[PDB]
């Protein structure tokens, strides 16, 4: 008995969406989802506003879903205050129209999001946990939403158990095309292994080529944007340097069947949750011009079950502030001339990347070792974060003797510190040599067995270790 | 409320110009990109209070703001105004105005903050951020007492309502624009500004049109920011209502402005502010406490409510006597202990929410404060910390707030004037706290 309007913008099949919702048992809701799969050509948004109380006249619609194009953020600025004037609807939205618009009127009632931009910074901290390539500079223009961003980032980085410290933040508004030699002077303050960048992508095709001509082309591949700040992931222009960092949102993933599978099912169960602790629901309307006087019934304590109700174990609680508290991000390294390349899967603000090592674009000398106090002290990692402290370095341990079917690495990391550890760190500071520190498996300083050597000598006779 | 039109203009970046609103929420140009102002917002009158700061050279306010975006923008405006005189005048009784306080709008007169204003001896009430609950503010003000002397009463033009006019005392000062004929005269002036804008536009280079066909033609109409820069270049000399050219955000930029005073329940005009020229009238200064005097500055008397925390050997405590007094105990020399009362912590015997108990309070502290009170001739009051801790600047995870924990946050908020303790000296404390010479030397 639920007035549901399904509106279509795009090219994907809607029938593959139909069985995405027709497969669930509808007996768990005790009220029938009456969906209405309507198509919609990409047309005038004022005609879409007319279409809103056209489909209200088609059926008393309480819940909507509407697929959307991926390049419509001004229309995302359009739709929300129309709702806050008149409706309490729900969309994903779709694509670029799912931009994080955190406007303050609570009567808009949209969940236009996944995670927030600040939640994207939060999982960017787990990226920082993964690579340990430091942030010393932060670059942005006047992109509204930056002061709270840098304040949250400073407040997090001042509460660390690690050696992570920030040195530079940069505000330079660059419509203003005269300030390219200013960035040539600002090369000194952008010397970081990892730099955060938040600008306008329309300006950034000029700005990134400017920064490449500044002398920052070698760091030009090591720059961070969210996928909303980034351009279209297919056919990215080459003024951006290749192999950049992708953060936020998904189309090659939970898709147009799956988003409406979140979708209507989330709506119908939330309504049944209003039928579960209140046993009621107010009636929807059909006369949008005149029923805007009839929003007296919109004492919306239903927003509790809007933001809190999950479905079938998938954590689907939301925040009313403009984000979802539960994450599903996307792959972390975008490629530019070629397509996105699937590298990272996100869950519980935690990354799954099947690499154990991260390259970039003088050599990593592979070094096997052995625990011996007070020289080599090997301890566990910080269990609040899984990594090492300020004066501590990771070390790579894997035992595959009990492995019988998948007899292969998959190293645990351990923390490592001690006397000679600081010595070899000083050597790596002097001769600028990177390394591959890992542990031994069999034999302390393993003896000669019929000519053959085990232990650390085994790694150097099999050339698995050049230094040890 | 005109945003269904102006945001559609913002779809095509065509400018829109306010003629009848001072709502500062529309001044957010990060959302209202298309908006410009022939009428300045609500916040712009707050800066005029800073130009009040040299009238009788006042330097100290107590300020309570109802929690609004306009009020917070006014807070940012006055914080921008106050951060000055980085040198290198040096008699510095300048606007270090003592206070800022928050208030939940729409609530009622359960404000003990009025009594907290009564504890500070300030000569001001000056500003709130409403006009309808301001009559309730007047009721709560006359409830204890604020209508008499020792308080100056000042409002702006959007603080004025008949209910407020039912309870504003004769002597409160209002600051009003010259804005009555704006429906005709400033309308003609604003279309004279757009006449100058099109006189620049027609003698400009190749500029595209905002063509026929609406929002369905989703490409944004390139000449939008071109029209914005055309309006940025417009400079009107003078109009009927008086005109100074635009600001950096396209504002009206007044100096067409008047000051009135409520007397005989009417707003008699006392002077005109013109840009920098505060030109007062020939009228007398009526103030509701019985002036025609100049009560500049605030009175500075005190009963020194000093806080302290129990710490041996500096502080010792005994519970009480049967009368609530203390037992007369002698030293090894027969001298009395001279224990002050030291009304202790509420929720004493910690973990149990009991009441305060007047102690028997001794150590170095009572002898030192008796010596100081006989030195400076200072009346005082004893207070005890219920927390039992010195305090660190804990970053509260709610909105990233580094607040000094414990009693140090209380004296930061002015719950006490000073503290005697084994006071550890740190760099972070000295950025907020005045310190004296080190009374003790240890390690």
């Amino acid at each position, epitope marked *: 008995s639920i007035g549901i309007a399904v509106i279509l913008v795009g090219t994907s099949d809607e029938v593959a969406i139909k069985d995405a919702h027709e497969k669930d048992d509808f007996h768990h809701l005790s009220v029938v989802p009456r969906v209405e799969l309507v198509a919609m050509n990409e047309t005038d948004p004022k005609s879409i506003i007319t279409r809103i109380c056209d489909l209200m006249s088609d059926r008393k619609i309480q819940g909507v879903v509407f697929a959307d194009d991926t390049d419509q953020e001004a229309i995302a600025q359009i739709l929300d205050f129309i709702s806050a004037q008149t409706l309490t609807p729900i969309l994903g939205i779709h694509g670029g129209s799912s931009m994080i618009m955190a406007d303050k009127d*609570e009567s808009s009632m949209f969940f236009q999001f996944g995670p927030s931009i600040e939640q994207q910074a939060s999982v960017m901290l787990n990226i920082m946990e993964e690579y340990d390539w430091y942030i010393f500079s932060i670059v942005t223009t006047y992109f509204p939403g930056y002061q709270d961003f840098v304040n949250k980032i400073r407040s997090t980085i001042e509460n660390s158990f690690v050696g992570w410290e920030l040195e530079e933040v940069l505000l330079l508004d660059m419509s203003l095309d005269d300030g390219d030699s200013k960035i040539q002077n600002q090369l000194k303050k952008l010397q970081s292994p990892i730099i955060l960048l938040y600008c306008t992508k329309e300006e950034a095709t000029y700005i990134f080529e400017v920064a490449n001509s500044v002398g920052l082309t070698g760091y030009g591949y090591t720059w961070i944007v969210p996928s909303l700040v980034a351009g279209d992931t297919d056919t990215v222009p080459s003024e951006f340097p290749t192999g950049l960092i992708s953060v936020s949102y998904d189309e090659w993933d939970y898709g147009l069947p799956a988003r409406v599978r979140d979708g209507i099912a989330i709506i119908t169960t939330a309504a049944s949750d209003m*039928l*579960s*602790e*209140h*046993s*009621f629901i*107010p009636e929807p309307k059909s006369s949008c011009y005149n029923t805007h006087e009839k929003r*007296i*019934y919109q*004492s*919306n*304590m239903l*927003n*509790r079950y809007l933001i809190n109700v999950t479905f079938e174990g998938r954590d689907l609680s939301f925040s*009313e502030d403009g984000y979802q508290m539960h994450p599903k991000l996307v792959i972390i390294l975008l490629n530019k001339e070629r397509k996105w390349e699937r590298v990272g899967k996100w869950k519980d603000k935690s990354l799954q990347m099947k690499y154990y090592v991260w390259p970039r674009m003088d050599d990593h000398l592979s070094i096997v070792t052995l625990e011996e106090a007070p020289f080599v002290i090997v301890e566990s990692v910080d269990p609040l974060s899984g990594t090492c402290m300020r004066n501590t370095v990771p070390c790579q341990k894997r035992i595959i003797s009990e492995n019988k079917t998948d007899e292969e690495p998959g190293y645990i990391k351990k923390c490592c510190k001690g006397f000679c550890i600081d010595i070899l760190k000083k050597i790596s500071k002097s001769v600028k040599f990177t390394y591959d520190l890992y542990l031994v498996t069999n034999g302390k300083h393993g003896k000669k067995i019929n000519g053959t050597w085990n232990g650390m000598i085994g790694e150097v006779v099999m050339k698995r270790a050049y230094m040890a | 409320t005109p945003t269904p039109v102006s945001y559609t203009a913002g779809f095509y970046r065509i400018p829109v110009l306010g003629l009848t609103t001072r709502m500062s929420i529309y001044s957010d140009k990060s959302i209202h990109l298309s908006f410009l102002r022939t009428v300045p917002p609500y916040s712009h009158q707050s800066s005029v209070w800073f130009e009040m700061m040299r009238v009788y050279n006042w330097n100290h306010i107590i300020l309570l703001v109802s929690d609004d975006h306009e009020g917070r923008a006014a807070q940012k405006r006055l914080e921008t105004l106050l951060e000055e005189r980085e040198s290198k005048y040096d008699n510095k009784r300048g606007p270090k105005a003592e206070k800022v306080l928050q208030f939940d709008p729409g*609530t*009622k007169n*359960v404000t003990a903050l009025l009594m907290e204003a009564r504890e500070l001896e300030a000569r001001v009430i000056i500003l709130s951020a409403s006009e309808d609950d301001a009559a309730t503010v007047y009721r709560a003000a006359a409830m204890l007492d604020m209508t008499g002397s020792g308080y100056v009463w000042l409002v702006g033009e959007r603080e004025i309502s008949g209910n407020a006019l039912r309870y504003a005392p004769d002597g409160i000062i209002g600051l009003q624009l010259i804005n009555g004929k704006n429906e005709s005269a400033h309308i003609s002036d604003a279309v004279g500004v757009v006449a100058q804008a099109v006189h620049e536009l027609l003698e400009k280079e190749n500029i595209t049109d905002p063509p026929r066909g609406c929002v369905g033609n989703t490409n944004i109409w390139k000449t939008g920011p071109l029209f914005k820069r055309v309006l940025m270049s417009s400079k009107y000399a003078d109009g009927v209502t008086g005109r100074v050219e635009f600001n950096e955000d396209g504002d009206r930029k007044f100096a067409q402005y008047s000051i009135m005073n409520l007397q005989n329940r009417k707003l008699v005009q006392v002077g005109i502010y013109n840009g920098t020229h505060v030109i007062p009238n020939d009228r007398k200064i009526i103030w509701p406490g019985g002036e025609t005097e100049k009560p500049r500055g605030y009175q500075m008397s005190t009963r020194l409510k000093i806080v302290t925390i129990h710490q041996e050997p500096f502080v010792y405590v005994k519970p009480t006597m049967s009368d609530g007094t203390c037992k007369e105990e002698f030293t090894v020399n027969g001298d009395p202990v001279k224990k002050v009362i030291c009304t202790g912590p509420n929720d004493t015997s910690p973990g149990s929410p009991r009441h305060t108990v007047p102690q028997c309070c001794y150590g170095f502290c009572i002898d030192l404060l008796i010596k100081l009170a006989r030195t400076m001739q200072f009346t005082y009051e004893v207070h005890l910390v219920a927390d039992g801790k010195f305090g660190t600047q804990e970053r509260v995870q709610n909105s990233n707030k580094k607040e000094w924990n414990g009693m140090m946050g209380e004296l930061l908020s002015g719950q006490a004037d000073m503290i005697v303790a084994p006071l550890t000296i740190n760099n972070e404390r000295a950025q907020y706290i005045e310190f004296s010479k080190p009374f003790k030397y240890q390690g």
Partner: antibody
Amino acid sequence: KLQESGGGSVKLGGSLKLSCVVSGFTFSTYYMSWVRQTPEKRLELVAVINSNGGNTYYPDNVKGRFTISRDNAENTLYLQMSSLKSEDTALYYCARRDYDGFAMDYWGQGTSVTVSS
Amino acid sequence: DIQLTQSPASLAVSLGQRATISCRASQSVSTSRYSYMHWYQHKPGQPPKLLIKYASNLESGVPARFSGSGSGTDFTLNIHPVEEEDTATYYCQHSWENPYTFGGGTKLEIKR
């Protein structure tokens, strides 16, 4: 404007049909209920019912005992009360639900069902 | 549930005073629609009535004696200058979940 009737003296464990006539509005746009005010001066909800006599709610002690019903054209509420206890000497009302659907919009003085021995 | 205590019930306060009632719930009911909580009034013999929609915002007919506020679990509901014609029982409790835990019974007495 709102009048509850149809009470009487029923035995413990017995049944009756309470009733209500309300005037002032159309019934198909407003929820209705049945309220219990015990002589021990604590309140309870007997039942509640949708605008069309559809979605109801019966509380935990109610869910073996009582049954609400509502005519949406004729201004009549009925309440079949079976398997009563000794504490069912309460004053029973109906109220004219709120615009959120919960609290009330106005009230009626109500009748009394006496359940004693 | 939203289980609340009404202190002091059966409270006797002299005339023309601030009769403040503390209401201590088990869980919170605050939202962006200014409250959830809703209250009550009846006199003995007189029909039951409502007193508070959500807050000091009242419906109609209630005099300016009352002023109620509070949030979460706490509700300070004061009556400014009190008189002896409203000395009766009020203040229903309820939960936004389906068991609407009524009762409490704040009987008003006047120190006559």
